[PDB]
Symmetry: none
Subunit: 173 residues, 6 copies
């Protein structure tokens, strides 16, 4: 059977543009792993607007899982290393828009620009959406804040330790 | 309905290593496809059948093969459904449209016993080198040193590894286009 | 017998020319409640041929000596590999074949329809070939005469054929209508003649 | 009354991968270095008619499938022991086999070693798979001989008067199964020549 | 050395056309290469007149003939006997050898094709012979690959040729097309090799 | 030892009249018929590198001046053998069956046709030159003799070629049909003599 997939769910109110986070997050994870995002044995699968829970609980597990397809059968057991959800959770995070980057009533127009400096970890270029300047993440069963860049740093680190240990443990048996 | 699974039947005498061959063959094919291997009993119900990519039919001996003509069929099956892509079987010393390959297993004199059977103890002990496609290390069973499969039609002798690679290619052949075709019907 | 109606589909590798013959044979076999016999490349025997309505000859290039025999009104008794199924006559109503990029008249006649496969630019991958994976995606809508569910392969979105003589454009669905129609009209002629003499 | 074992190359490959071109060219070049010629053994050989002690004998399609007559012939040619091969006509009967090199080819996966396996594989000095590169690949995944034959503009070889993609590696390579090292026609010639120059230096330093 | 020439043999009883087939086959082939035919006499002794013609013919091959035949169809230089000191010296470099012989080890290996010749029933004379006059009479339609006018001798209506290993049938026209194909192969191969050295 | 003179076509136009679209497509259609390809000479050329005896060779911008192009041209279009320059020391006699050239005594006798290009005013920009973006939209119908699919370039809708010597207008597809007819006629000539005898 399989390593449990590391998974990040993003809780927030509409207009926070959470899909802008799970998108930026998944892409940046599928690149490191030279892959794409699924929304064919992809690395990351994005599950946006999660109310679904029987289908989730069957992805994020250690069992072997075969998901339904429209086409009959067709080599496809679910193997995605990461699951990013927006609404088993390695991380469980609240979305927070800095008041500065809020519209009259999130202001993506302003929140998406290129800061002069590029001090990122996982992005070829920097922005307020990844520098933490415009948007932050807080685990709720741990009181740590993240930027888009540092949450993707965490999730790659955690998958790596889980794989090393989880792989040599299964060898024991 | 389905693409008829590729099937190999390994014919051999006793002491020839039939179920070492079939064992290893189906298990390497599984490992490629992130699946496992259902061991059908000799004189076979289908308890434990959990849509494994491969199922091994040992000591084919008729009760047995009226069930085989259903497993290796293009139509569907609900065994006392069956979606395994591969069937590896083995029979006595001495329908066939279903056998994609039909191999006589054969032991090299070097790994023969004094009583003229395979020397599995030694044959099982690993070789240092790996000129192999489907295994992370080989033994004289995978490499043709101890165990070889001679196609009955071709009359040619192959190693287990190369006959593996051929069962995977002949299914990738069926699989490419034929999958979306039925998806349409 | 009634000369089977033949479609040859000419296309370079990658334009998806055996998706076409595959779907076309399968769709004509269903309409006629049969199946499809696929005749292997460089055929020596016809071993699974139990009188399916459609036989497919992919990658036809010993090929045209055969091809000449199947697509005619003369009696063909193909060679079998097992005696247990020998002696039967070749009676498929349709022969769908595909071949390479581009006596000679001896064949040209056999083709009721001689088509080129085209790949729409929208479904053309980087390397100038069919976008195989995208084109299988079912369509929301099914405006087809012959299929239970539509797809860019069936209706005209990914691939289309074009008769070389007539220049008509066709989709997999429309070409199916065109082959069936022709057989209906051949069967209709031949029937009324054998109705006057049985 | 015996001799230095000929340095032997076997080339394994699917048909239509340049296998017989490669044997052709390696033989001819090696033959050029030693100012001799190529004797080509026929398939399923019965008799060596035409074998005039050429430095290289080529043995294409070793072990076509019939009955193993080929591996017994090959074990006699590639040995230290004297060998007087049969001939159809009496006009050239009695000549000893004295090729310094023997180049053979066969299919990709067939096992030609019958029985006494470990001693046979020793005779092969190099036991190579033939691979076409993917630019020179063509539909059906086989070699496009026409293009692979256009003369290269450069000649970096060690052994050829002129160079084409069959010679320098651009179109066809060989990989030594045991060493996993990739070679072109040009560099496996140099290896074969170095190994023979090696065996002659020994024999004569010991005698 | 030289490319072994591709060789065809036409086994047939007398008056089954066997000698017309070799002449027609050899002439057409020689025409395609812009050359002529050198025809060995029966019970050949010498090669007088041989000027390295693309094709040489050998009829009633019955061993003087054999030992002789076996050196023509080879890789190894064969300078054949002359009866005129002025001619002698020439090596044998013909690209094809066409031969015929009587009704019924290592030789069989040198025949690139080996054929029984067949007179079709229609054209059999009153007693199991070729009706040469009528078979020579020309055809109105011309579907041959290698003659500018057609005739039963060439398209397969009069005489046919049956290969004894492949059991395949040929007309004079088609066997001329196999042979030209089979030299083109060898030609092409040994060509790129020679170009390189 | 000498060659059927290739048939030539020159397309005299101001630049921006799809002069280049015209020669490009014309050359490809002809080469696709003869199962070959097209060798494009750079304008004001010096070497023929890449020449492999493509059936069609193209000669963009003829007389751009100083006689460079024209001595090259008179040699390509002739009966006398021709060995063009190579800049890579790379058998390359010039043997192309057609020469399509575009520009801006014994010379004007080698032209088979000698044509002005002409946009039709339905497809003229406000600034005077071919609206390429519209002219390359595929036509739905295909009445052409030499194409898989039709375009106002192929077709005569957007681009036309008028012979100066005779006053016949042409489309890409019908000039293609005339040029082929001419070439096959010149190779008929050997076959038509042989017919009368
Ligand atoms: Zn920033
Ligand atoms: Zn091994
Ligand atoms: Zn559709
Ligand atoms: Zn090179
Ligand atoms: Zn005739
Ligand atoms: Zn048009």
């Amino acid at each position: 059977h399989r390593i449990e997939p590391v998974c990040l769910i993003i809780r927030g109110s509409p207009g926070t543009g959470k899909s802008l986070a799970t998108g930026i997050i998944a892409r940046a994870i599928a690149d490191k792993y030279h892959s794409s995002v699924y929304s064919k044995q992809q690395v990351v699968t994005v599950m946006d607007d999660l109310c679904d829970m029987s289908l989730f609980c069957q992805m994020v597990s250690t069992v072997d899982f075969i998901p339904p397809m429209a086409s009959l059968a067709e080599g496809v057991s679910f193997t995605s290393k990461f699951v990013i959800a927006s609404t088993r959770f390695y991380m469980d995070c609240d979305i927070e828009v800095t008041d500065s980057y809020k519209t009259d009533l999130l202001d993506a127009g302003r929140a998406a620009k290129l800061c002069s400096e590029n001090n990122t970890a996982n992005f070829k270029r920097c922005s307020p959406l990844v520098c933490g300047k415009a948007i932050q993440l807080r685990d709720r069963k741990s009181k740590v804040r993240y930027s888009v860049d540092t949450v993707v740093s965490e999730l790659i680190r955690e998958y790596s330790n889980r794989s090393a240990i989880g792989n040599t443990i299964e060898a024991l048996f």
